[PDB]
Amino acid sequence: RKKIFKPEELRQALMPTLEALYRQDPESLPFRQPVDPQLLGIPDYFDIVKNPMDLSTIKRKLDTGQYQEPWQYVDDVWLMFNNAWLYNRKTSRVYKFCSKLAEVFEQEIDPVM
Ligand SMILES: COc1ccc(N2C(=O)CC[C@H]2c2nc(-c3ccc4onc(C)c4c3)cn2C[C@@H](C)N2CCOCC2)cc1Cl
């Protein structure tokens, strides 16, 4: 089950699953850029989230061939969701938006896997 992927083959296969998340409006808006705790007024963010991830970082990694294997891309998307569920309360808009993106992703990534 070892396989060497061509970065452009990975990119073409995975990019549509990422585009599916970006297309969610307004649910993708809090996930489009890295969390800046001071500028968002959430100074405890890095006390709780030690491995931040967002759509712009995942896109940059896809675009520069930093994923060797599909599971590495999926791990970063899952990390982004896990961070938002960890930091935010179940009652919050961001937590609910995260749950929407995770549903969309589960649909998109199944066939690709
Ligand atoms: C359309 O939905 C929203 C619009 C604004 C906001 N925001 C606010 O109410 C305050 C600032 C802004 C905002 N919140 C967050 C926020 C906060 C906590 C988070 O935990 N995990 C994540 C991810 C996360 C994200 C981010 N933002 C700023 C977003 C909307 N920027 C706005 C500037 O352009 C890029 C996107 C949140 C949402 Cl759910």
- Ligand 1 pocket member 64 (CB < 6 A): no
CA dist., res. 40 & res. 36, Å (int) = 6
- Ligand 1 centroid vs 26 CA: distance in angstroms? 10
Q: What whole-number distance in Å separates Cα of residue 44 and Cα of residue 112?
A: 36
**What number does the ligand 1 atom closest to the CA of 84 have?**
21
Say if residues 35 and 54 touch (Cβ distance below 8 Å).
Answer: yes
| Domains in the chain with CATH codes | 1-113 (1.20.920.10)
User: Ligand 1, atom 27: nearest CA belongs to which residue?
Assistant: 30
Query: Resolution in angstroms, to 1 decimal, for this deposition?
Result: 1.5
Whole-number Å distance between alpha carbons of 37 and 100: 23
Q: Are 56 and 36 in contact (CB under 8 A)?
A: no
Our CA angle for 73, 57, 79, nearest 5°, is 50
Contacts by residues 83-88 (CB-CB < 8 Å, ≥ 24 positions apart): 83/49, 83/51, 83/52, 83/53, 84/30, 84/31, 86/48, 86/49, 87/42, 87/45, 87/48, 87/49
Tell me the angle at which helices 93-112 and 7-22 cross, rounded to the nearest 10 degrees: 140
